[PDB]
Amino acid sequence: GIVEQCCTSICSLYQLENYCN
Amino acid sequence: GIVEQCCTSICSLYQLENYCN
Amino acid sequence: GIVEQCCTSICSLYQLENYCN
Amino acid sequence: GIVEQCCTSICSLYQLENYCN
Amino acid sequence: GIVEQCCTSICSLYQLENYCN
Amino acid sequence: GIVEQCCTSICSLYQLENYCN
Amino acid sequence: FVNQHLCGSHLVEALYLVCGERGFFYTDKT
Amino acid sequence: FVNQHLCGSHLVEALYLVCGERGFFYTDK
Amino acid sequence: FVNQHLCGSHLVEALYLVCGERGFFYTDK
Amino acid sequence: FVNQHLCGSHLVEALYLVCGERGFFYTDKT
Amino acid sequence: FVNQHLCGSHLVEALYLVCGERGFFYTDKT
Amino acid sequence: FVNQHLCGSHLVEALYLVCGERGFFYTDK
Ligand SMILES: Cc1cccc(O)c1
Numbered sequence: 292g293i294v295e296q297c298c299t300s301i302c303s304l305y306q307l308e309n310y311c312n
Numbered sequence: 313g314i315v316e317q318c319c320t321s322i323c324s325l326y327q328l329e330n331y332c333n
Numbered sequence: 334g335i336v337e338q339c340c341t342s343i344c345s346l347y348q349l350e351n352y353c354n
Numbered sequence: 355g356i357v358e359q360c361c362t363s364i365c366s367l368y369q370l371e372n373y374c375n
Numbered sequence: 376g377i378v379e380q381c382c383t384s385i386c387s388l389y390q391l392e393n394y395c396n
Numbered sequence: 397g398i399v400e401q402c403c404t405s406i407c408s409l410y411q412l413e414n415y416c417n
Numbered sequence: 418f419v420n421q422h423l424c425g426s427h428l429v430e431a432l433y434l435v436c437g438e439r440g441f442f443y444t445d446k447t
Numbered sequence: 448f449v450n451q452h453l454c455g456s457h458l459v460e461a462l463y464l465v466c467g468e469r470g471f472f473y474t475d476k
Numbered sequence: 477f478v479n480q481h482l483c484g485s486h487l488v489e490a491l492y493l494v495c496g497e498r499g500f501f502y503t504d505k
Numbered sequence: 506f507v508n509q510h511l512c513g514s515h516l517v518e519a520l521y522l523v524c525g526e527r528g529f530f531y532t533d534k535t
Numbered sequence: 536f537v538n539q540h541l542c543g544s545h546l547v548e549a550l551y552l553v554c555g556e557r558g559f560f561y562t563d564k565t
Numbered sequence: 566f567v568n569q570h571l572c573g574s575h576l577v578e579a580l581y582l583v584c585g586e587r588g589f590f591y592t593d594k
Pocket residue numbers: 296297298300301302303454457458461522567570
């Protein structure tokens with residue numbers, strides 16, 4: 292999810308916007 | 313909403329918890 | 334102390350209030 | 355500068371990026 | 376106190392250090 | 397650099413000021 | 418718990434801490 | 448469980464900035 | 477010594493929120 | 506992206522996130 | 536060091552950084 | 566790559582406080 296994807300490696304703001312709304 | 317309750321006014325802990333899932 | 338207790342595992346706000354004052 | 359653009363006024367993302375290297 | 380010195384007015388580093396143990 | 401020096405071990409504010417400007 | 422205006426990032430951090438494993442929903446402005 | 452917990456503190460602050468007025472959900476499992 | 481140092485940054489921000497006007501001490505050893 | 510005044514530490518955090526591997530320069534006041 | 540109002544969480548973060556291994560005491564309001 | 570990324574979030578907030586009006590650069594490589 293966001294934690295598996297963005298805590299192992301860096302999520303850019305572009306990656307992170309996927310999780311908006 | 314949370315912004316209007318806890319940012320423009322001050323919320324209690326209990327009030328803040330209404331925005332938990 | 335707080336660091337041994339709350340850096341290894343998660344302290345909730347309830348756990349953390351123990352360290353107030 | 356960044357402070358006068360984005361703190362005293364509001365900056366867009368694009369505006370914020372002018373301060374990247 | 377710290378709030379009245381450094382939040383309502385501005386504190387120096389030296390002033391901030393008065394609240395170290 | 398700052399990351400090798402200050403992420404492995406703690407940089408104090410004194411250490412960190414080296415990286416100002 | 419604080420008696421403070423909590424806004425922007427501080428509001429989210431507070432929800433994060435308060436809600437624990439439940440997680441939360443942030444609407445921003447309604 | 449801190450490293451993931453500490454990571455999530457940053458993630459929520461990042462999502463706040465990126466999503467802005469759209470907002471977001473933060474939950475799993 | 478960062479991971480504990482970085483952890484303590486979050487802990488102090490958390491204690492600020494939870495203790496509010498009671499305040500707190502942050503020290504050991 | 507937020508439509509907000511971003512000041513002090515929040516401004517730097519925003520630049521940090523926005524700029525990624527490029528990094529950034531923070532002048533503070535000019 | 537900054538010439539800024541430091542309040543709420545920012546004040547605590549500043550004390551945390553400034554005080555190092557000594558640690559600190561936060562009264563909030565007196 | 567998070568631990569260094571998460572570390573850098575704190576470093577930039579620390580440099581903000583310590584450098585104040587002098588400011589700073591944040592980049593390498
Ligand atoms: C901005 C950010 C915070 C935490 C983890 C990430 O991958 C990205």
